[PDB]
Write a protein that binds this DNA or RNA. Structure first.
Lengths: 100, 141, 206, 143, 55, 63, 63, 82, 145
RNA sequence: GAGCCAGCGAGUCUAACCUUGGCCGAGAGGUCUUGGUAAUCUUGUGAAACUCCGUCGUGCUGGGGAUAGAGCAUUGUAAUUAUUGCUCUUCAACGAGGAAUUCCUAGUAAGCGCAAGUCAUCAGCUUGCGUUGAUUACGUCCCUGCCCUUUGUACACACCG
RNA sequence: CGAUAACGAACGAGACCUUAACCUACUAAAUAGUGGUGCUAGCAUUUGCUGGUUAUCCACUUCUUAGAGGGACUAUCGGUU
C-alpha cells in the first residue's frame, strides 16, 4: 500500500503530539514504519520598516514565520489506513497523505 | 572487520570528516594525497601535526578525509583538526592511554587549535550599517 | 636520523624538519637571543612555527599580543591600506621572500636581523599633550617595552610600504633592505629617521 | 602503485596534457580561435594565442573526469568570473558557451568524453585510461 | 486591544491591556520567572535511640 | 647614547588629561634598591623593564 | 558584572533558612536537589540560585 | 579646481627594451658580484626595461651564474655561483 | 630565454597613416597608440598579419608594417568577422566600414552634423554641448563649464 | 590561462516562475526539451577577493573608464531626452586629496562577492548571508554629551532663558 | 552589601524568548549522509588506489538535519575587600 503521511505546521507541540500519537498507534498495531523524519525548518522572513511615513531613524524590523515539516512512511491495508487518516486531526496542524 | 574510527574538524563553515583505519601508511584528502592541498604554504601548516609527532605514528594506518564549506584556508584548518583528532581517537580506541596522552600533550602544547575548535562564531549584521558594528555615516549639514 | 617511508611519499627535507626541530623550510628559530633585555618577554621566540599565519585569539586580553610570534605580528602589520585588507596569504608570501632576500645578503639568520632591527628602531622616549586652555603644549615621557615593539613594527612596515609605492622595487625586497638598514643603523632608513626625529622632539620638550 | 589525476598535481598535469594534445595530431579547432575573448567579461583575449584551446581542453577533461556529469552551462559558470562594469562594481558573469560546446564536441570526437544520460557528459573508459596514463608519465617526467 | 471611536468632534483611541493571573493559565507557563516557591519540609521527631522495626 | 635600565615594580595610575600616560615606580638595576617614580606611554604592569634616556628626574603629575 | 539580583539572593536565603541540613557544599547536588525542591521556571535561574546557595554554605561552614 | 600637489617632470627614463653588443657583454661581465639579483636589481642598477631583466634572468639561470633559491613569479631571488 | 642583438633596423619612432607611432614599446600597444584602433583590433590585426607579438614596434620591417596597415584599411577582405568594425552598416551605403586615424573625427563630425541639420534632439544636445545620452545633469559635472 | 571553496534564501495551476540538458550564435541571447509546489530540481548556487604560472613595466602607460559614434539582442502596447545587455571605436579628469569630519575594540574593522526587497525590464540602494581577516586600547573626562548628589540663580514659551 | 523615620510593595533593569556555538549520549531518516556487499570503469597489477551504480541489497548516524534533554553557576585554587 506504501503511504506517506506528512505534517506541515508551525505550532510545534501540536505537530509533535500528532506525530507521537500516530507512531504509538502504529507501533501498538505493530506496523512497519520509518521514524518521524524531521525536515529542516524553514524561516520565512519579511523585513520592512517600522515607520509608516519617511522620517525618524532608519529602523528595520524583521518578522519571521517558522514552518516545521515532518513525514513518515507506512504500510497497512485500506480499512485500517482510512481509519488512521480520519483519526489524529489536531487543530493548527495541516496534514496530507500521498501514495507510491 | 577492521580497527577504524571516524572523526572530524570544524571551522567557520568548513567540516572535514576523516576516516582512519589500519592500512599501509597513506594519507588522502578528497581522494588526493596530503601533498596536494594547494594553498602551498598552508600545506606546511597542515603537515605540522605529523611533523611534530613524526611519521612513525602513521606507519600502518590509512587516513582519508573529505571536506566542505568555506574558504581554502578554513578548509585547511578543518583538515588539520580532523587528522589530529582522528589520530588521537585511534590511540584512544586501540593503543594505550600513555601514547595517546603524550601525543595529545604534544599537540596541545604546540597549539590548542588542533583539538579544540575556534569558537569565534560570526556575529550577524544589524541595520544601520554595512556590518555588525560599523554604522554608515552621520551627516549634519 | 633515519628517513622513514610510508605508502604516500613525503619530501625528505620536510621529514628532516620533522625529526630534529621544527623550523621553516630552512631557518632555525634558535640562537636568536636578543640584545635588549627590556624588549625580551615582549618578543616571541623558542616556540617555533612553520607558517606565519595562525588564528591566535590575541586581541581578547591585554598582553596576549605579546605572546604572539613576532613574525606573525610583522605579517599582520603588512596587510593594510585598504586594498590589502585581509590577504594574509600575500603577507606571508612577502615575508618568505623578504627573509630569503635578507639571508642571501648579510648571511646570518634573517630572523636575527629582524629582531636586532626592531630593537634598534625602538623609540625610547616620546611626547604627550598637556592641555592649557586656549593653546596646547607638549611634555616628554618614557615608553613601554610593548609600545616600543608595536611602534617599531609599524615604523618598519610603513617605511617599506611607502618606499615600495610607485616604484619598481618590490615590497619583499624593499622590506628586506629597510630591515637590514634598521638592523645596522643607517640614518637613511625611514624607520631610524622617524625614530631619532621623535627622540629629538622629546629631548626638546623634556 | 597505481596512479590517477587526483594523485598528480593540478597545473603541471594540465600543462603536460595540453602539450601532449597539441603534438597529438589533429584534435579539432572551431575556426574562430585567435578572435574571441573566451567570455563576456574578459576585457582581452588570451596570451598563448596559438595555444589555450588545448589548455581549455586539458582542463575540461580533468574536470569532467574528477566529476561525473556536467554541462556547458556548468562550464560557463565555472570558467567565467569577475567583470569590471566600468565605474559600476564588479560582478560575476558567465564565459563563452560557444567555446565550451566546441571543446566538448571536439572531446566527443576524440572520444575522451561521452554524452551521458540524466543530462550531460561523462568520462569514457578510453578517456579514463589515457588521462590517468598521461598522469603516470608526467610525475616521472621531472627526472 | 486597540479601538477607534467616532464622536462628532473627532476620533478617540482606546487601548486596553489585561494581565491575567499566571497560576490559572492551564496551558503554558503557570508562573512568572522572578516568582519561585519554597516548599515546606515536614520537620521530624528524632530517633531518640537506635532501634529497628522488622517487616 | 648613555641610557639607564630600570624596572617597574609598582604602577601608580593613569595620568595625562586623556588617560594617555601612566605613573610607575621604577627601580634602577645598576645600584639596586635606589627607587624613582616616573611616567610611561604604552601599556605596562609590574616587573617590567624599561630604558630611560636619563635617570635623574621624577615628574610627579600632569594635566 | 557577576552580581546577582534579589530573587536569586532571597531564594538562596530561604532555602538555606529551612533546608540547611539536606543540602551541602557541592554545586552539583545543590542543583540536582534545587530542581525538585523549589519549582523554578528557568534553568539558568536554577543554576544561579544553586551557585549563591553554595557561596553561602561555604560562608556558614567557616563562621 | 585645486590640486595640493606639484606634479613636476622627471627623467622619463630610457631603460632599454632591446639591447646591443655593448649592453650584452656589459651585462655578462657585470651581473656577478651582485650577491642579490632580481628584476628590480637589474632595472635600477643597469637601467634596462623589466622585460630585458626577466629574459636575461632566464638566460643567466640557463647558462648558470645566478643560482636561484626561489623561482616564484613576481619575485625572483638569485645568488651568484661560487 | 631568446636573446638577440638589435642593430640599426630599430628606430625610436616611426610613422603609420598620418600618425606618429612610438618604437621602444610592444607593437600591439604601439598600434593602439594610432587613433581609430584599440587593444582588440590591434591584437586581432597583428595575429592576422602573422607577425611576432613578443617583438617591439621599432624593431620591425617596412614589409610587416605595410602589411599591417593594408589589413587595417580593408579589414573585411582579410577575414575579420564584421562585428569588430567601428562603423558597420553605414547610414549612406549600408556597407560595413572601418574608420581610421584621421577619418574618425571627420566622420564623427559628419554624422553629428547630420543629426544637427535634421533638427534631432541628440543633434541639438551635441550642438549646445549638453549631455546627449539622457544623463542626469543637475548634480554631476559642473567642472566642465 | 590554470587551480578553484561558501552561507542566508526564492521559485509555475489553471499560471506561465526557477530553470538543468543538448543545438545555434563572438556575445548579449535564441532554440527544442527536462526537473521542481521543493532538504528532493534549479544548485555542491563550481560567487568574488584569492592562490600558481606567464605578459607588462614606473610610462596620465596594458592605471582609470567617464565621454561620445556605429551596430546586434532582450523586456514591454510603447523605449525618442540612449531602460538594460553585448560588440568595436573615442581614452577626459584622477598622480593619496585643504580647512574639517564620520564609523570602529573582535572573527569586530576593512577587502570580497552572493541571495532577498523593489521588479515586465532596470542596482552604483537597502535588508540579510557567508569568504579573506589586521593594526591599535582594557583607559580618561581633555573635547562632545549623559546619570546621581551638593551648591547658586533676577531662569519656567525653563541659557536658543 | 549594608546604613537608616522608615516599613512593605509595584513598573523599568535583570529574569524571559530567539539565534549562534558544545554533545562521537537518546528518538530516528535514500527528500541528509557514511561504511560494506554484489554489478561495473581506469591505473598498477604484487597485495592496492581512484571511481560510476536505486530496486543490488546489508548495517550505522560521526558529519547533516531537527525533537526531548544536558551543559556555565564565574566551578575550583590563590590574592584583595
Amino acid at each position: 500500500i506504501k503511504i506517506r503521511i506528512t505534517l506541515t505546521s508551525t505550532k510545534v507541540k501540536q505537530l509533535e503530539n500528532v506525530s507521537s500519537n500516530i507512531v504509538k498507534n502504529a507501533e501498538q498495531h505493530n506496523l512497519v514504519k520509518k521514524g518521524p523524519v524531521r525536515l529542516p525548518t524553514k524561516v520565512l522572513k519579511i523585513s520592512t520598516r517600522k515607520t509608516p511615513n519617511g522620517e525618524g531613524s532608519k529602523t528595520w524590523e524583521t518578522y519571521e514565520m517558522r514552518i516545521h515539516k515532518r513525514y513518515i512512511d507506512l504500510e497497512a491495508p485500506v480499512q485500517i489506513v482510512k481509519r488512521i487518516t480520519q483519526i489524529t486531526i489536531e487543530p493548527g496542524v495541516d496534514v496530507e497523505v500521498v501514495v507510491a | 572487520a577492521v580497527p577504524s574510527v571516524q572523526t572530524f574538524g570544524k571551522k567557520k563553515s568548513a567540516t572535514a570528516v576523516a576516516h582512519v583505519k589500519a592500512g599501509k601508511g597513506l594519507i588522502k584528502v578528497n581522494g588526493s594525497p596530503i601533498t596536494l592541498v594547494e594553498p602551498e604554504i598552508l600545506r606546511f601548516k597542515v603537515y605540522e601535526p605529523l611533523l611534530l609527532v613524526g611519521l612513525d605514528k602513521f606507519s600502518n594506518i590509512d587516513i582519508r578525509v573529505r571536506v566542505t564549506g568555506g574558504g581554502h584556508v578554513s578548509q585547511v584548518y578543518a583538515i588539520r583538526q580532523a587528522i589530529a583528532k582522528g589520530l588521537v581517537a585511534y590511540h584512544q580506541k586501540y593503543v594505550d592511554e600513555q601514547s595517546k596522552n603524550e601525543l595529545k600533550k604534544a599537540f596541545t602544547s604546540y597549539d590548542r587549535t588542533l583539538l579544540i575548535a575556534d569558537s569565534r562564531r560570526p556575529e550577524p549584521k544589524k541595520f544601520g550599517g554595512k556590518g555588525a558594528r560599523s554604522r554608515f555615516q552621520k551627516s549634519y549639514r | 636520523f633515519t628517513p622513514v617511508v610510508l605508502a604516500t611519499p613525503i619530501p625528505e627535507e620536510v621529514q628532516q624538519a620533522q625529526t630534529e626541530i621544527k623550523l621553516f623550510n630552512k631557518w632555525s628559530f634558535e640562537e636568536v637571543e636578543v640584545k635588549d633585555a627590556s624588549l625580551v618577554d615582549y618578543v616571541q621566540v623558542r616556540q617555533p612555527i612553520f607558517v606565519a599565519h595562525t588564528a591566535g585569539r590575541y586581541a581578547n586580553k591585554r598582553f596576549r599580543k605579546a605572546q604572539c610570534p613576532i613574525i606573525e605580528r610583522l605579517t599582520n602589520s603588512l596587510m593594510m591600506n585598504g586594498r590589502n585588507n585581509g590577504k594574509k596569504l600575500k603577507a606571508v608570501r612577502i615575508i618568505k621572500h623578504t627573509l630569503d632576500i635578507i639571508n642571501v645578503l648579510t648571511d646570518q639568520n634573517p630572523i636575527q636581523v629582524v629582531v636586532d632591527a626592531i630593537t634598534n628602531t625602538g623609540p625610547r622616549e616620546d611626547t604627550t599633550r598637556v592641555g592649557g586652555g586656549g593653546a596646547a603644549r607638549r611634555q616628554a615621557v618614557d615608553v613601554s617595552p610593548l609600545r616600543r615593539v608595536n611602534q617599531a613594527i609599524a615604523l618598519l612596515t610603513i617605511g617599506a610600504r611607502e618606499a615600495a609605492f610607485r616604484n619598481i622595487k618590490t615590497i619583499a625586497e624593499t622590506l628586506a633592505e629597510e630591515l637590514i638598514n634598521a638592523a645596522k643603523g643607517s640614518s637613511t632608513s625611514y624607520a631610524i629617521k622617524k625614530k631619532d626625529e621623535l627622540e629629538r622632539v622629546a629631548k626638546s620638550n623634556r | 602503485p597505481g596512479v590517477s589525476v587526483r594523485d598528480v598535481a593540478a597545473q603541471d598535469f594540465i600543462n603536460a596534457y595540453a602539450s601532449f594534445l597539441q603534438r597529438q595530431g589533429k584534435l579539432e579547432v572551431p575556426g574562430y580561435v585567435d578572435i574571441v575573448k573566451t567570455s563576456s567579461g574578459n576585457e582581452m583575449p588570451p596570451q598563448d594565442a596559438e595555444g589555450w584551446f588545448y589548455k581549455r581542453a586539458a582542463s575540461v577533461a580533468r574536470h569532467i573526469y574528477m566529476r561525473k556529469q556536467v554541462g556547458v552551462g556548468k562550464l560557463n559558470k565555472l570558467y567565467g568570473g569577475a567583470k569590471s562594469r566600468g565605474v559600476r562594481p564588479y560582478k560575476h558573469i558567465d564565459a563563452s558557451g560557444s567555446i565550451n560546446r566546441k571543446v566538448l564536441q571536439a572531446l566527443e570526437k576524440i572520444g575522451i568524453v561521452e554524452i551521458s544520460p540524466k543530462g550531460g557528459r561523462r568520462i569514457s573508459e578510453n578517456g579514463q585510461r589515457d588521462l590517468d596514463r598521461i598522469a603516470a608519465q608526467t610525475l616521472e617526467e621531472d627526472e | 486591544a486597540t479601538r477607534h471611536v467616532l464622536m462628532r468632534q473627532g476620533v478617540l483611541g482606546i487601548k486596553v491591556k489585561i494581565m491575567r493571573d499566571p497560576a490559572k493559565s492551564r496551558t503554558g507557563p503557570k508562573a512568572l520567572p522572578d516568582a519561585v516557591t519554597i516548599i515546606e519540609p515536614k520537620e521530624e521527631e528524632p530517633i531518640l535511640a537506635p532501634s529497628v522495626k522488622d517487616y | 647614547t648613555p641610557v639607564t635600565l630600570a624596572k617597574v615594580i609598582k604602577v601608580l595610575g593613569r595620568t595625562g588629561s586623556r588617560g594617555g600616560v601612566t605613573q610607575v615606580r621604577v627601580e634602577f638595576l645598576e645600584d639596586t634598591s635606589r627607587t624613582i617614580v616616573r611616567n610611561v606611554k604604552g601599556p605596562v604592569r609590574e616587573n617590567d623593564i624599561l630604558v630611560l634616556m636619563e635617570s635623574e628626574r621624577e615628574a610627579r603629575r600632569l594635566r | 558584572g557577576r552580581v546577582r539580583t534579589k530573587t536569586v539572593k532571597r531564594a538562596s536565603k530561604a532555602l538555606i533558612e529551612r533546608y540547611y541540613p539536606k543540602l551541602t557544599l557541592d554545586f552539583q547536588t545543590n542543583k540536582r536537589l534545587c530542581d525538585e525542591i523549589a519549582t523554578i521556571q528557568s534553568k539558568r535561574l536554577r543554576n544561579k540560585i544553586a551557585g549563591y546557595t553554595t557561596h553561602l554554605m561555604k560562608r556558614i561552614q567557616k563562621g | 579646481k585645486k590640486k595640493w600637489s606639484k606634479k613636476s617632470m622627471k627623467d622619463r627614463a630610457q631603460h632599454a627594451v632591446i639591447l646591443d653588443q655593448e649592453k650584452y657583454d656589459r651585462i655578462l661581465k657585470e651581473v656577478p658580484t651582485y650577491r642579490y639579483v632580481s628584476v628590480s636589481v637589474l632595472v635600477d642598477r643597469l637601467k634596462i626595461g623589466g622585460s630585458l631583466a626577466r629574459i636575461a634572468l632566464r638566460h643567466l639561470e640557463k647558462e648558470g651564474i645566478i643560482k636561484p633559491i626561489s623561482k616564484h613569479s613576481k619575485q625572483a631571488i638569485y645568488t651568484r655561483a661560487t | 630565454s631568446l636573446v638577440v642583438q638589435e642593430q640599426g633596423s630599430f628606430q625610436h619612432i616611426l610613422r603609420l597613416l598620418n600618425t606618429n607611432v612610438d618604437g621602444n614599446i610592444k607593437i600591439v600597444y604601439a598600434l593602439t597608440t594610432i587613433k581609430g584602433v584599440g587593444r582588440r583590433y590591434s591584437n586581432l590585426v597583428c595575429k592576422k598579419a602573422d607577425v611576432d607579438l613578443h617583438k617591439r614596434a621599432g624593431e620591425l620591417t617596412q614589409e610587416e608594417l605595410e602589411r599591417i596597415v593594408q589589413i587595417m584599411q580593408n579589414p573585411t577582405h582579410y577575414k575579420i568577422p564584421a562585428w569588430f568594425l567601428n562603423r558597420q552598416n553605414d547610414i549612406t551605403d549600408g556597407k560595413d566600414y572601418h574608420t581610421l586615424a584621421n577619418n574618425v573625427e571627420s566622420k564623427l563630425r559628419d554624422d553629428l552634423e547630420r543629426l544637427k541639420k535634421i533638427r534631432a534632439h541628440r543633434g541639438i544636445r551635441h550642438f549646445w554641448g549638453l549631455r546627449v545620452r539622457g544623463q542626469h545633469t543637475k548634480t554631476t559635472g559642473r567642472r566642465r563649464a
